[PDB]
Write a protein that binds this ligand. Sequence first.
Ligand SMILES: O=c1[nH]cnc2c(CN[C@@H](CO)CCP(=O)(O)O)c[nH]c12
Ligand SMILES: O=c1[nH]cnc2c(CN[C@@H](CO)CCP(=O)(O)O)c[nH]c12
Lengths: 212, 215
Amino acid sequence: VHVVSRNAEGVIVVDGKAYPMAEELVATESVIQRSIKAVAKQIADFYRPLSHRDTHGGGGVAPISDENPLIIISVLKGSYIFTADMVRYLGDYGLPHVVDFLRVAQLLAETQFKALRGKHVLILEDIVDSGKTLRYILDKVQREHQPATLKVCVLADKPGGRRVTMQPDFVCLTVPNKYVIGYGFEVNDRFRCFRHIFTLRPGEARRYPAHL
Amino acid sequence: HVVSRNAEGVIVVDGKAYPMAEELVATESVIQRSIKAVAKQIADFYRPLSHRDTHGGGGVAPISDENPLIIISVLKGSYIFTADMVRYLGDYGLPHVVDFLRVASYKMQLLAETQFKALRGKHVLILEDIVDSGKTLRYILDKVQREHQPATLKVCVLADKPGGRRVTMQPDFVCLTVPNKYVIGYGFEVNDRFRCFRHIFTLRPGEARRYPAHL
Ligand SMILES: O=c1[nH]cnc2c(CN[C@@H](CO)CCP(=O)(O)O)c[nH]c12
Ligand SMILES: O=c1[nH]cnc2c(CN[C@@H](CO)CCP(=O)(O)O)c[nH]c12
């Protein structure tokens, strides 16, 4: 159980640690991890039955296996902690998979995987808010890799912030229509190390204006 | 944890078989206890230090959320280790930020550059999965020092394979010491396979060319 309280300064305290930058708690580590593991079982149950191009034994189609694993593309930098946890749960459920990374801001870093044609590909992303970043990534991966199927798993969905149509295939958590921090979520790279997700106090997104 | 061998002689950890493994090096519990211990050492070492103030356009200021410790994680092998380390560093209250670089051998070449552009006069810590020959980290350390001119440059490794050294390299922080064998699990892999394992194992010698096709 997590002990959630407020100190004399009105600041949220979780397990004895103060979060002066936070407005409200969204989810404790225990809720987050249970949510990720639940989605991990959904992903393993969905993909383990499927088949795709055979690049190990010369063709044509073969079941997802260690020889022909599910291809996972993780979006850096926001999804790295979520991806680290998700892949370990996927391993627990016996899903054969491999992970590669793309970095976006503009594309800053490209995938090194060069044989995704006719493969099942899953994108791990931290959050869908406006839908624009995933629309950009999905168009690029489809056009350059020509996968058999392309699906998206997000840690968080902020359904009220949409500016374009984007419905992820897998969602671990629904977040309020507020700026979130913690468990990968940042303010200029600060707060990603938190084990819990919180809403940010209004105006604190300008707390660290200096480029790192 | 329960670690045994089945009737086929295959290592089984917590009811799970690892037919590719020769020996178990470390269980999840040992690895996690080891990482948190080094996190306390890193927090105890950096907490009281000061460096260039880029927040208040000042001269020098203590390590803080305004001027955090700069952490550079070496992709891809270090991402799981880094994810866990940062959360332990947060438990110990070390203000820090993380960026990523990626190197490969052909001789070494940079695959992905860091995006941080104000590291001069800052304390920098490299997070790497393993030091074996020492060649990758001598390359990374030489490049970060020359291009960023940090105040201090230190290295934390999840694993030290002491018997593999071909150039002088002793990381400042080491979570685990591994045998002089090919390790797998917890970030370590064979063509990207086995990274998801929660335990570290040695690889059976005939399993290293099992997945020859490029991904
Ligand atoms: O709430 C939040 N807290 C911290 N960061 C974010 C982001 C930025 N995330 C990137 C993806 O990594 C773009 C998503 P999109 O284009 O879909 O808006 C949206 N909401 C939040
Ligand atoms: O044993 C191992 N199992 C799985 N991978 C490796 C690597 C590759 N790791 C790089 C950094 O990612 C360091 C190379 P080095 O220090 O030799 O220059 C060395 N040993 C092993």
